[PDB]
A paper describes a structure:
To address this question, we determined high-resolution crystal structures of a bacterial homologue to the mammalian PepT1 protein from Streptococcus thermophilus, PepTSt in complex with physiologically relevant di- and tripeptides in addition to a peptide-free apo form. The POT/PTR family contains a number of conserved sequence motifs and a conserved architecture consisting of 12 or 14 transmembrane α-helices arranged into N (H1–6)- and C-terminal (H7–12) bundles 3,10–12. A centrally located peptide-binding site is highly conserved between prokaryote and eukaryote members, with both operating via similar transport mechanisms. Conserved pairs of salt bridge interactions coordinate structural rearrangements that lead to the vectorial co-transport of peptides and protons across the membrane 3,11.
Author numbering: 6 to 271, 276 to 413, 420 to 478
The structure:
């Protein structure tokens, strides 16, 4: 008796992540429109450009805390309570938005989910591995099934939460995301006791008595500095929301920049570290375009599409839908393609070009029909079809390339945060008048950088 040939404990983690992703993407399917609504009622005193910028840097920070939660579980609290309390914090963030408050609660909600997701996201995946003994061949299949639950929860969420918003408003819709995470907690708590190893109720590499003080020193310096920077900013008058967004952008980009300067400074090993830079650049750019689906394309869906008969947030389901459609294809493909399968950097290259083609595609309707009318939903369908096609190329191979150390490995995960941070800047350039320029410009540029990468793709391979 199994769960698709896997240990029964996988079903518990399948359900857990499905409902967490449900809560996350259900919220992000409507959060932008929600901010638009608050602005329209004079409740939220920002521009739409700023609102969209918030979406991007919010994503960026969620990914950033994700690279930290694994450490916290392994060394301090344990993987299983990390997931649980991470879940509680996520639920609370959604609770906060369900309350009769308005713009005043946006910050508290965002902070809660950033921290909570950071605790839950990397450690659920960790617990999936713990189901299999070392050298169990089912491991790949198991993680593949787990990912399917992630995509599934991301697919039904905008459909259900978006419908709820249309029916009963934002506060009810947000409460459904909260309920979703709660379901995840229910199945996780009572399901984990039955099948998860008690070993992971505690940290696996707990701090040694001599390790505690320098860690405390380390984290307290970082906080002190961060606080100091925020102090100076307010003194010199750089205390607007765009200013803080710029600060987090800087932090998000400085972290990998420092790591690269750190590695390159500290002979044969070296060339590869330099060799990874164009790949890391290609990763950031792909994620940038891909992350804009919930921001720029969300705006385009709400303003430029004949979507009078269905909740416009439903467009956010296309991303995980195409992932699920493409997945069993590429599974077969990389297997059947035995003879001369492309290298990992080529995938990176072609992947970025596809993401670039997705934006180029979106430039056509405005150039052909103008940007004052509305166009068919199919333009967006085609765009997501393309960029997900690019994801199938670069995503399954991403951590594979970069692992050919500990900070270096984290940097694949950070490419997601940096592309999103870059988005916090670029996304403010998009509007009705600049639409055709925006898409063409960043579309062509991405393709060319993919063109460059394929030229470079052999030297890097050999290394
Ligand atoms: C792997 C999939 C490849 C997909 C790439 C591109 C395919 C889809 C392109 C979208 C064509 C636009 C649809 C035009 C249409 O239906 O007519 C409506 C007209 O009013 C235009 O707004
Ligand atoms: C919120 C809905 C779930 C019901 C749980 C009620 C218990 C309330 C407080 C105590 C919870 C601490 C649990 C920590 C933990 O590691 O749980 C995970 C493990 O037991 C199962 O996977
Ligand atoms: C451990 C408990 C988890 C419970 C999750 C939270 C959900 C429970 C109740 C949801 C509240 C519904 C929203 C109330 C509301 O004001 O709706 C909108 C109203 O203003 C008019 O449309
Ligand atoms: C199995 C492959 C099927 C699709 C081929 C891949 C993409 C190549 C070309 C797609 C079309 C490019 C955009 C042009 C376009 O949609 O024009 C539409 C009309 O202008 C709308 O009335
Ligand atoms: C592999 C996909 C191939 C798809 C078909 C080729 C697409 C090439 C260019 C499409 C964009 C052309 C739009 C028309 C346009 O902008 O006209 C401009 C006029 O001068 C404006 O007054
Ligand atoms: C399906 C595969 C790839 C399809 C994408 C091919 C599209 C080719 C070029 C993108 C759009 C062309 C730019 C149009 C343009 O800049 O003209 C200016 C407008 O008239 C006004 O802004």
């Amino acid at each position: 008796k199994t769960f698709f040939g896997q240990p029964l404990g996988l079903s518990t983690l399948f359900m857990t992540e499905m409902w967490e992703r449900f809560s996350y993407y259900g919220m992000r399917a409507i959060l932008l429109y929600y901010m638009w609504f608050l602005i329209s009622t004079g409740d939220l005193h920002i521009t739409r450009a700023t609102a969209a910028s918030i979406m991007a840097i919010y994503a960026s920070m969620v990914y950033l805390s994700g690279t930290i939660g694994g450490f916290v579980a392994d060394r301090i609290i344990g993987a299983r309570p990390a997931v649980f309390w991470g879940g509680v914090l996520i639920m609370l963030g959604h609770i906060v938005l369900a309350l009769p408050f308005g713009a005043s609660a946006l910050f508290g909600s965002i902070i809660l989910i950033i921290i909570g997701t950071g605790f839950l996201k990397p450690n659920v995946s960790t617990l999936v591995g713990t189901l299999y003994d070392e050298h169990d061949r089912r491991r790949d299949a198991g993680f593949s099934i787990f990912v399917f639950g992630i995509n599934l929860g991301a697919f039904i969420a905008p459909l259900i939460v978006g419908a709820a918003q249309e029916a009963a408003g934002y506060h009810v819709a947000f409460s459904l995301a909260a309920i979703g995470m709660f379901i995840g907690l229910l199945v996780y708590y009572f399901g984990g006791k039955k099948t998860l190893d008690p070993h992971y109720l505690r940290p696996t590499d707990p701090l040694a008595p001599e390790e505690v003080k320098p860690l405390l020193v380390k984290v307290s310096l970082a906080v002190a500095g961060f606080i100091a920077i925020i102090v100076v900013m307010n003194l010199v008058g750089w205390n607007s929301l765009p200013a803080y967004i710029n600060l987090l952008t800087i932090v998000a980009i400085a972290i990998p920049v420092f790591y690269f300067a750190w590695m390159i400074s500290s002979s044969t090993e070296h060339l590869r570290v330099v060799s990874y830079i164009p790949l890391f650049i290609a990763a950031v750019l792909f994620w940038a375009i891909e992350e804009q689906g919930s921001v720029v394309l969300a705006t385009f869906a709400a303003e430029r599409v004949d979507s009078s008969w269905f909740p416009v947030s439903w467009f956010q389901s296309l991303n995980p839908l195409f992932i699920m459609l493409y997945t069993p294809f590429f599974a077969w493909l990389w297997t059947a393609w035995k003879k001369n399968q492309p290298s990992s950097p080529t995938k990176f290259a072609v992947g970025l070009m596809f993401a670039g083609l997705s934006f180029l595609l979106m430039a056509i309707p405005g150039a052909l029909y103008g940007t004052s009318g509305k166009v068919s939903p199919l333009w967006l369908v085609g765009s997501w079809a393309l960029v997900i096609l690019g994801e199938m190329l670069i995503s399954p191979v991403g951590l594979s390339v970069t692992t050919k150390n500990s900070q270096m490995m984290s940097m694949w995960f950070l490419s997601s945060s940096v592309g999103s941070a870059l988005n916090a800047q670029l996304v403010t350039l998009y509007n009705a008048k600049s639409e055709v320029a925006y898409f063409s410009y960043f579309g062509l540029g991405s393709v060319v950088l993919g063109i460059v990468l394929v030229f470079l793709s052999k030297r890097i391979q050999g290394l």
